[PDB]
Design a protein around this nucleic acid. Sequence first.
DNA 1: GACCACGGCCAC
DNA 2: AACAGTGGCCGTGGTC
Length: 540
Amino acid sequence: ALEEAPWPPPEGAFVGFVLSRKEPMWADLLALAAARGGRVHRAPEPYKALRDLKEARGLLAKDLSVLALREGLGLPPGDDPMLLAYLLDPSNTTPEGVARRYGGEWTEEAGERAALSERLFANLWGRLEGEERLLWLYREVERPLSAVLAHMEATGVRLDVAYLRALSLEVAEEIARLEAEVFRLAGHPFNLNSRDQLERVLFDELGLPAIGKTEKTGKRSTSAAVLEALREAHPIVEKILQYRELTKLKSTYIDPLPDLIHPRTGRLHTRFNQTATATGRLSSSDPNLQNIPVRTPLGQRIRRAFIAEEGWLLVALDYSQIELRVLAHLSGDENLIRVFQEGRDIHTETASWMFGVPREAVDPLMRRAAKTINFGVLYGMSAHRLSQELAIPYEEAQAFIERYFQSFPKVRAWIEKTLEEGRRRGYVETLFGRRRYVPDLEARVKSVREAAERMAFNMPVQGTAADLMKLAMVKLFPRLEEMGARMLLQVHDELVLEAPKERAEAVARLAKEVMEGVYPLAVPLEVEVGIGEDWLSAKE
DNA sequence: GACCACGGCCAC
DNA sequence: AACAGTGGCCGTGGTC
Ligand SMILES: O=c1[nH]c(=O)n([C@H]2C[C@H](O)[C@@H](COP(=O)(O)OP(=O)(O)OP(=O)(O)O)O2)cc1-c1cc2cc(F)ccc2o1
Ligand SMILES: [Mg+2]
């Protein structure tokens, strides 16, 4: 409907657009349109009509702003109805769902998408009248952030391609050595990547005992948790775990990332998805740069392929024990506050208990293990499972979990307060009022209910940490531009910046402090910073 | 070619 | 595998 009016559109219209593909840095702009009033404007030529707009306002605004930066046009994103819906309910994650929940249909034509962004904005902005805290998250965090992420997306990161090509051939020859040493240990060749075939070999032809089953189809599981408990029980299980790590890293990172360098930028560009998680975290895709390996030695080799441009340095900043400090603030547990008001490290302490060694002896491989253990226990891992992780008695793990929550008694009072409040209001909230609707808290099936409970009390603390990080990013981005530095990646509690060599020390010291004082809590936020030519040695 | 479900596994 | 939570991508095995 509306009324075809001649392009250009008046100021502050709502833009709709169609891309050749979902990735803004790689897409052709097929159609461009705008609407304000009862008028829909359609562009004769989309790439020239981008010159006319002063701001991107509408569904998926960040995406068009990214494509604009790719053509050297500073066109910042503004209002996006997706961002309002996502603050109303974080299950509002795609425009198909949002339009089919607030009064329209998400089609494939720019004009119709423009007019939809106009009405979708009116509706949701009305639904947020009086939700002053969500209106605060919108004006102060989420809408500014979409601009920051647009500049991150369009900048990209430099990758050592020749090095990854070379690493590919090396890993390939090693995969072949393990494959053959499994085909032999099994008396024949089969597809080692087919989990079904491997099931028959491990559990039928050989004699190994099936520890567990898969969720949907009830097959015998060949997961690492299962195979780890079948080590020494046969050497072939050890080789399969080696083969699995290598083909994972090769087919997910080593091989596809080099072929994704952009021809204009010479760099690698991810997408930061702003309305994609239930807790408020960002996500990253196409490629996901938030899960580049690091823990294993081959993984470290891959993390080193992410490097600074000629004449710059990477600066890496990572909040320490972030969800535990948030937890101390949220609960008000005094003993836990006192841990951080005294610079204690709960991952290195759990690691010394867990390995026997003195605190001065825990090395990175050990601390990493205690991180997963501590966060495992915190969010409700069963005694029985912990006893299988730590290889201890069951009543020994019950005490580890009773000692853990006894040294900080006020936490369980907060878990319970959080749950009871969620049953009454239907949602739980972070420190700034970001909310997750958790309807299954009154479920009558125990398993469905207790899962709802674990998602329910995790969200306030993980979404508070993500709120801090996002706010730090909007406070830091303007200061980095003064110094001529840039933001590259965010990995949940961590930032990577690129800075000129003769300014790196300055941007590190600065960025460290903006992050630490983003929002004073009842506990000091520490940050670790490092500088290097590559992502790995930046992280000290 | 394009989707999809599933088990599996990388990061935080 | 499971009474830890949050993501996204892979190959396999299908269907259309
Ligand atoms: O299993 C987990 N479950 C979970 O819920 N998280 C959340 C809570 C954290 O606060 C937050 C930030 O992760 P993080 O930065 O790595 O942890 P942290 O800030 O507490 O520690 P430090 O920076 O001081 O080393 O992710 C993290 C982990 C986890 C285990 C682990 C092992 C590694 F080898 C490397 C990274 C790891 O992540
Ligand atoms: Mg951290």
